Design a protein around this nucleic acid. Structure first.
Ligand SMILES: [Zn+2]
Ligand SMILES: [Zn+2]
Ligand SMILES: [Zn+2]
Ligand SMILES: [Zn+2]
Lengths: 463, 463
RNA sequence: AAAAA
RNA sequence: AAAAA
């Protein structure tokens, strides 16, 4: 009547954790990143960014005085009102780096959470500056500096670990939230770079050990998941810049470099090259003086003794007049304005509102890409047009991406071996690219690979 | 009553040279380059290329057997029948380098001119191979090797001077034709590179002295005159390739590199990297063995003693079987097939016609761009699809251009200071980009800057 | 921006 | 793929 047809060994389940991955902002769009990681009933928020182009389509603005509510309806900033419906209390706000798509909403949203803001030293300095420029909401949460390679226990069941990575701004980290059932890893804005010009190589060994210890969930950017291969090193940008600036038969001509003021590795390269060209490096622009000065005070870069740095309009204009009457061949201005922003140094030069006059053959070196949004493309087209009309020669995109490409994501998947993967930090189209890559690596959509929309919570019941 | 005055010029002179610039091929399209430079009644032909896509649009076509005329009506090769209306006699055929768009039509056209063929040593070697493959015309012309930095007297009134430059094939030169009335310079297929990984830096000093001695006319490629800035050095390709091959946590995986067989610098870099990865470099493909072997026999590259090189199908399949049964982690195959050409090694691997089996995670590295014509895009799309369907990971465009960008052209104008400029080697769209640059430099179209079409002769007289 | 065999 | 002042 009866036969044996199987024996199955059952596993043990000594710890049970409920994990929630809540997509708040930056999952339907570029910008305004914010994620919530719930461990049972405690929550770690990671990043609170701004989406700058939603500010740029309205012309009055000034975000420093607008209320959270109106910025959420412009969106602009993440709609964190969904957090009233998430079953837990926030115990920390973590920011992975200092770009505005990760910290820009801090002075608008952070003050409603009874939680410290935790970041790397440079990032905490920039968060403090952002909060001091705010004055409709009174913000200062506790701000805690945590370095790459260190841990901080938030709850007896939750610890936060910073893992060094590389990116287009210094002191970027992966975040590992350790729970009784394993680690949730957040890897948004990162780049593998084995020859960084500043900082250290990403901590591949520790990525491997976390992979073997157990990752419940990887949250990672999909921004360049559709670019084939691997991201070129920042060393490539450094060498291209060096050859643009030094490899020329026209060395006595006027030259201006413009780049992201927060790209401290790029600025560092430019300043060193200035020494090699026998020119005096002159950093111009409030943002240049703030970001680079801050990096210098924290020991992140050294600066030559002859560097000059001006952030105020009168010293900027004075410095430009000095440059003009001493000979542009004697200086290397490094200035704000690479996206044609209004008020920035290079835009004021291009409008003729400055003692510096561009002349035929002067070289303007954009050590940056054009942000692919129509607003910034218009500003940059107007700026470039004005400079070309005065005879400038344009060297564009002397630059490499700050983001991981498809094969970098492949290797990060192979090292962290997460049980579940969640693309973040992009449009649904970018997540589509990431999804195809993750399925070539063995993941299945809706099972171990998850596509979230803003406002959606993924529940993971881990045994 | 009324009155004015005027000084009548003297008729006295205080020999007259007529220059003809004849566009034969490559002025309306990419490929099939050919220019004739007439000095009164002597003519120097420069280049006789083939245009390969006009061959690829016809199925089962053996150009080695076709007559000149039918290839001209395919166009394909330059229509030199216009030379029956040019009032001069050809005294020399110069080739600036060994790419097929400069030498491919030599065995179809050169034999009707009572003239030597003059080129650099590597280029004469490749021209001899091109003539040995020809099965329709018996060719015939004396072949003369002239090195960069040397001069050769062609006529009592005409000498030819080779000036060293850089390009994606070794031994490329600018050509300066000296006439009683000054120099006509031909710079088609050049790149400024101050850190080449093979050969010497372009001879900038001699370009400057040529500018001051007097250049009547510059004929120069417009290929990338629309790319802003300056061409990245070949060292950039060398470092990106090095980081793709060495900068990885998955080093025991299968890796294949494919690149242009004639790009001896790239091949050299790859072979050295193989030594550094502890893998054995194995070059595969008839073209690879011919181009690389020729470079080695002439002392243009050294090769490690553990190199293996197979050009015949039997030795290639045997080598791939050895690779498979010894472990793909022990070899770095460097092979033909980067444009998905049929019959090339990587296409045969991708079709499963080979003992080598692509497996999940194997890395296929294209150290090359996809040629932008629909035929080649179709081949490369079919190849890439087949490789991806077997689990391959594709690293594409690990590569920098072989051609001057807009600002390289700017500086070359600044150094040669030609009285007249003629874009060549491209479509009218590329010449359009070049024209905008040359007018920023002071030239005027139809006066000192000239847009020519295939079949047209430009007359330049002494004032 | 050039082939491949 | 990020601002500027
Ligand atoms: Zn970022
Ligand atoms: Zn970001
Ligand atoms: Zn060429
Ligand atoms: Zn060419």
């Amino acid at each position: 009547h009866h036969h044996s047809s199987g024996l199955v060994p059952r596993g043990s389940h000594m710890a049970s954790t409920e994990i929630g991955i809540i997509a708040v902002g930056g999952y339907n769009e570029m910008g305004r990143n914010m994620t919530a990681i719930r461990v049972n009933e405690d929550i770690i928020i990671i990043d609170m960014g701004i989406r700058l182009d939603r500010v740029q389509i309205h012309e009055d603005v000034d975000t420093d005085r607008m209320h959270s509510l109106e910025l959420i309806e412009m969106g602009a900033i993440p709609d964190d009102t969904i957090m009233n419906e998430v079953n837990g209390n926030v115990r920390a706000i973590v920011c992975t780096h200092g770009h505005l798509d990760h910290i820009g909403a801090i002075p608008k949203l952070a003050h409603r959470y009874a939680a410290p803001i935790i970041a790397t030293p440079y990032t905490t300095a920039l968060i403090k500056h952002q909060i001091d420029s705010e004055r409709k909401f009174g913000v200062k949460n506790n701000i805690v500096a945590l370095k790459a390679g260190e841990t901080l226990e938030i709850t007896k069941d939750i610890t936060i670990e910073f893992i060094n990575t590389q990116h287009s701004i210094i002191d970027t980290v992966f975040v590992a939230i350790h729970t009784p059932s394993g680690a949730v890893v957040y890897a948004c804005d990162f780049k593998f770079d084995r020859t960084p010009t500043l900082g250290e190589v990403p901590d591949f060994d520790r990525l491997k050990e976390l992979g073997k210890e157990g990752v419940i969930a990887l949250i990672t950017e999909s921004t360049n998941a559709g670019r084939n291969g691997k991201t070129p090193s920042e060393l490539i940008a450094h060498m291209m810049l060096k050859d643009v600036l030094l490899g020329t038969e026209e060395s006595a001509v006027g030259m201006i470099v413009t780049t992201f003021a927060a790209h401290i590795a790029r600025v560092n390269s430019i300043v060193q090259f200035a020494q090699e060209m026998g020119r005096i490096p002159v950093l111009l622009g409030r943002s240049m003086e703030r970001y680079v000065g801050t990096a210098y005070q924290l020991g992140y870069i050294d600066l030559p003794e002859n560097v000059e740095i001006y952030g105020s309009r009168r010293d900027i204009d004075n410095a430009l007049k000095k440059i003009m009457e001493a000979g542009k061949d004697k200086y290397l201005p490094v200035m704000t304005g690479h996206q044609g922003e209004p008020g920035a140094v290079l835009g004021r030069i291009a409008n003729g509102e400055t003692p510096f006059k561009v002349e035929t053959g002067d070289r303007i070196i954009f050590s940056a890409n054009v942000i692919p949004n129509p607003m910034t493309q218009a500003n940059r087209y107007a700026l470039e047009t004005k400079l070309k009309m005065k005879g400038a020669r344009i060297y564009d995109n002397v630059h490499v991406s700050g983001h991981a490409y498809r094969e970098d994501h492949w290797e990060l998947l192979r090292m962290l071996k997460p049980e579940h993967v969640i693309p973040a930090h992009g449009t649904i189209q970018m997540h589509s690219e990431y999804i195809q890559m993750a399925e070539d690596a063995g993941y299945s959509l809706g099972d171990t690979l998850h596509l979230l929309r803003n406002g959606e919570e993924l529940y993971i019941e881990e045994d």
